Amino acid sequence: AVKYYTLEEIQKHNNAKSTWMIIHYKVYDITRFLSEHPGGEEVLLEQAGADATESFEDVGHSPDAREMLKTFIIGELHPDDR
Ligand code: HEM
């Protein structure tokens, strides 16, 4: 079963030492990619600990980027927060 994380817990992972993000209700820990993102680290920090779905789609990420995203998954957003 997937683990659920609350928005309350996810918001605590909002800096360079630990960055989590929600994208389409899936929760990712991208801390280790913060310095390797082709779009740079600052745009990730700007939305660290939050739902970045809209920004991820608006930028227009490639299929390869979406396959890479799967490698950072840790769970899904708790339903009380959906
Ligand atoms: C945490 C999951 C994310 C992953 C795995 C990811 C991955 C990537 C990859 C692989 C690229 C290279 C081009 C491509 O393949 O599309 C890229 C480019 C980029 N990303 Fe992300 N990204 C993520 C989140 C974001 C977020 C949240 C933002 C917005 C704040 C963002 C903004 C950008 C920008 C501006 C570029 C470069 C411009 C572009 O080529 O149009 N990315 N990202």
Interatomic CA distance for residues 21 and 74, integer angstroms: 10
- The residue extents of the domains of the chain are 1-82
- What experiment produced this structure? X-ray
Please name the helix (run of DSSP H) or strand (run of DSSP E) that holds residue 53, with its range, or none: helix 53-59
C-alpha dihedral sign at 17, 8, 23, 59:
negative
Q: Of 59, 71, 72, which is best to mutate to test ligand 1, by the most ligand atoms within 8 angstroms of its C-beta? A: 59
Sign of CA pseudo-dihedral 24, 68, 27, 12: negative
Angle among Cα 53, 57, 62 to the nearest 5 degrees reads: 125
1-82 CATH: 3.10.120.10
- DSSP helix/strand/coil, 34: coil
Q: Which strand (E) or helix (H) includes residue 23?
A: strand 18-23
How far is the centre of ligand 1, averaged over its atoms, from the C-alpha of 57 (Å)? 9
The CA distances from residue 79 to 1, 6, 43, in Å, are 14, 8, 27
CB 7 within 8 Å of CB 76: no
Q: Is 24 annotated as a binding residue?
A: no
Burial class (CB in 10 A: 0-12, 13-18, 19+), 54: exposed
Resolution in A: 1.7
d(CA 5, CA 64): 26
